[PDB]
Design a protein around this nucleic acid. Structure first.
Ligand SMILES: [K+]
Ligand SMILES: [K+]
Length: 327
DNA sequence: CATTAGA
DNA sequence: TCTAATG
């Protein structure tokens, strides 16, 4: 957590590099299990050799550990850090819709900057265009105070369209968080569950609502179960317009809400931990259901869930307010 | 790890 | 169809 920090930090830098700038999925994966292992190890690595006794730790890596230990740096890291192409790729990637593969291509063609991207809007796809168009606001945080104004509107049209809808704004928002990165709305309807052959409209109706009133301003992607968009709070009585915000809406079979909701509320650890516990408690939890364990090794058969509680009860734990689902 | 665009 | 990108 801190005794082998520089090593893990260096290592992740290393990995991340092979993956993006290079297409070394392998080296990439290498730097990672290592970074992973050296992290668990309870003692200060004092030499590569020492490191090296680890699993995943080879001669390539170990050598890097000495250099890093010896001198507070690493050239390869220093060289990459300087590297314009590579820098370039790192940046392009910040554009929503740009991933490594496109980043490399764009660079290939010579589009290394924001302005470059501009002049060539033609080379970009809708998603990419939008991300470009909203590069600044996409990077901005979402203050809760706004999260509250967003949730407000959201729940309103949802209700207006059909009163039978159930929505929840998940994520760290749900967990307290002073601010968030984007808004995550989980959606369901009684009329749609595991079997009940869809109702694509179910999603459509609301997107259309939100649009109708200008909550929604763009669409990155719209499918029959997962809508990914851009939204904006009504710019008041002027002098202050709001930044464009990423919003994601998802349809869910009512019969899988709460687990979905559980899960997406996190946190990453609260989850893992509650989950680890359902294992002892003779269960299995995951984004959609909660099945009881069977001695033979594994088992099935989804237990019925009508609330976050059902799940809690089941693993015979203390209902944890989302506020304190921190870990 | 599943859903969507796209080409 | 596959492959990329988000989450
Ligand atoms: K080893
Ligand atoms: K990106």
């Amino acid at each position: 957590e801190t005794l082998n920090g520089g090593i893990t930090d260096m290592l992740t830098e290393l990995a991340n590099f092979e993956k993006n700038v290079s297409q070394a999925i392998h080296k990439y994966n290498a730097y990672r299990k290592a970074a992973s292992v050296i992290a668990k190890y309870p003692h200060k690595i004092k030499s590569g050799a020492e490191a090296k006794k680890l699993p995943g730790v080879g001669t390539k890596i170990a050598e890097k550990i000495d250099e890093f230990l010896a001198t507070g740096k690493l050239r390869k890291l220093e060289k990459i850090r300087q590297d314009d192409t590579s820098s370039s790729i790192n940046f392009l990637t910040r554009v929503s819709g740009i991933g490594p593969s496109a980043a490399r291509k764009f660079v290939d063609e010579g589009i290394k900057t924001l302005e470059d991207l501009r002049k060539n809007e033609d080379k970009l796809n809708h998603h990419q265009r939008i991300g470009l168009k909203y590069f600044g606001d996409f990077e901005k945080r979402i203050p809760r105070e706004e999260m509250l104004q967003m949730q407000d509107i959201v729940l309103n049209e949802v209700k207006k369209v059909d009163s039978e809808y159930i929505a929840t704004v998940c994520g760290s928002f749900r967990r307290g968080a002073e601010s968030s990165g984007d808004m995550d709305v989980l959606l369901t309807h009684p009329s749609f569950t595991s079997e009940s052959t869809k109702q694509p409209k179910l999603l459509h109706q609301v997107v259309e609502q939100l649009q109708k009133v200008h909550f929604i301003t763009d669409t990155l992607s719209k499918g029959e179960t997962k809508f990914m968009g851009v939204c904006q709070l009504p710019s008041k009585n002027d002098e202050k317009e709001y930044p464009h915000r990423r919003i994601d809406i998802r349809l869910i079979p009512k019969d899988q809400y709460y687990c979905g909701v559980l899960y997406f509320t996190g946190s990453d650890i609260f989850n893992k931990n509650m989950r680890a516990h359902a294992l002892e408690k003779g269960f299995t939890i995951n984004e959609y259901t909660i099945r009881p364990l069977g001695v033979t090794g594994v088992a099935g058969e989804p237990l019925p869930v009508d609330s976050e509680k059902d799940i809690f009860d089941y693993i015979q734990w203390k209902y944890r307010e989302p506020k304190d689902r921190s870990e």
